Design a protein around this ligand. Sequence first.
Ligand SMILES: [Cl-]
Ligand SMILES: [Cl-]
Ligand SMILES: [Cl-]
Ligand SMILES: [Cl-]
Lengths: 141, 141, 141, 141
Amino acid sequence: ASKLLPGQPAIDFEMLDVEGNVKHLADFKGKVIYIDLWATWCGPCIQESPAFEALGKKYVGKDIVFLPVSTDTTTKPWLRYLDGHKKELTQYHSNDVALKESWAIMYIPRFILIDKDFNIVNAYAPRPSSEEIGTLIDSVL
Amino acid sequence: ASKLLPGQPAIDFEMLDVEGNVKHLADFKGKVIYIDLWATWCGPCIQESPAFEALGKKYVGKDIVFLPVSTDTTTKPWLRYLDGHKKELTQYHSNDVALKESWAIMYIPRFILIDKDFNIVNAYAPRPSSEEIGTLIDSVL
Amino acid sequence: ASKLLPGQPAIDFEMLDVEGNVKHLADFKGKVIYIDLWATWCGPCIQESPAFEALGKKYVGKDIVFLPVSTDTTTKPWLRYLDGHKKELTQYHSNDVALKESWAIMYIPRFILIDKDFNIVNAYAPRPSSEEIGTLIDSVL
Amino acid sequence: ASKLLPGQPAIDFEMLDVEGNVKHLADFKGKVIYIDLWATWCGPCIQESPAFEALGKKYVGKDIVFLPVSTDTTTKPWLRYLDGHKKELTQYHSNDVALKESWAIMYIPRFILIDKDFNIVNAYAPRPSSEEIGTLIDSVL
Ligand SMILES: [Cl-]
Ligand SMILES: [Cl-]
Ligand SMILES: [Cl-]
Ligand SMILES: [Cl-]
């Protein structure tokens, strides 16, 4: 569609933390938001996890949040996975219908970059291991 | 584990066709079996589909079967996907527990190669777009 | 750098066809230009070739040119490769210093998208097999 | 061919270290040998470097050597790359004709696994980031 063009308002969705608190994407409004949509059985998604974590470490304390969002059909394999593989970033999970119907999340790995105005920078953002992601992030920070 | 070593007997599992008939992996005993475990939301899995189909075309009429097996949690998005994307190979689907607990299918894309004796050639077989898969298949044919 | 930002003028470079005629990127000014920088020993580059060719077929007769540009250190393995693997798109080759020093081509696979004004749309464009490339191309056509 | 089948003797080749000393693959006879054939402009090759290094760290002091071997046409961009990107593994470089003509190294990324008897385990070995490489390495150690 065209509601995903750069400059278009980001579409809010809800997500759960590992403690079960519901959060909203809009809660992070005012910060650059880089989203990693992954699932526990997606090999290539997990291959981007070190880069995503490393980016999260590099930009710690800057006005950007890195949101790893599991799209696992159910919560339990997500929590079991996290139990055996430590991560540093705060982890989220979502089956919000808005992912499929507003963000057009048809395939993963999928990355999304949103600016401080809560507008889309790239709805199909470069992967965290790409050579250009840092430069892109710096441009919007 | 070690029940997945080459030479080990292949582990049977059941799968559904698009008409709903239950089939067994063991039904293909006597033919080389090359399995593509994919899901409709796995981008990198779908990226291997042209190569898998092309291989299926090249070896048509040889004593080998190419089994694309969806691991989608439910049947409906699998059928909807197939509705919009034609394929030539006969399509299957499975949530058999044996996939996770005997074949150790933890991540996809995942490929499996079994010989005519129904023994494992490689439980973590090369991808269909790899340079060596044809040679490997020819070795076991 | 920042001479690669979207909206920045594209940087011209020269390229050879298989007949040895020198062409310039600027020769295609007025058409959308989608560039595939590859090399004969780059496996993942060649894995994008069917998608690049398929795109070239889909947009045939539209005001867009698809430029596969080999960056092989020398011409001979490029011609030998082409001899054994037919393609439909007109093939080019370049070792122009502008690739490394103006376009920052440090790694391949690398794709570039330029608009009809000869301005950069994305200097690190999505791969031809990506779900969003068609939509991106359509936006600039 | 068939001189690359598992169980076939490994084919020796020469390689340079960063100090310029010529070494031979056969110098490592008696140890498991896992080879990473990469080049400085191969993006996907460099994406496997953290996994290759991590494996090297995990098996430190075991009877296995991890050989990163640059296939860059010339030595200078290899040394310049290494200058700006630190690594822990001892680095090698090779343009030995045996790579192309005996090991059939046509595309990279390419990995090779050899046993203590200096026999081929897999001439097209799994990538270092694959789920099965550790198990494979353990089987031959
Ligand atoms: Cl998507
Ligand atoms: Cl798996
Ligand atoms: Cl590049
Ligand atoms: Cl190769």
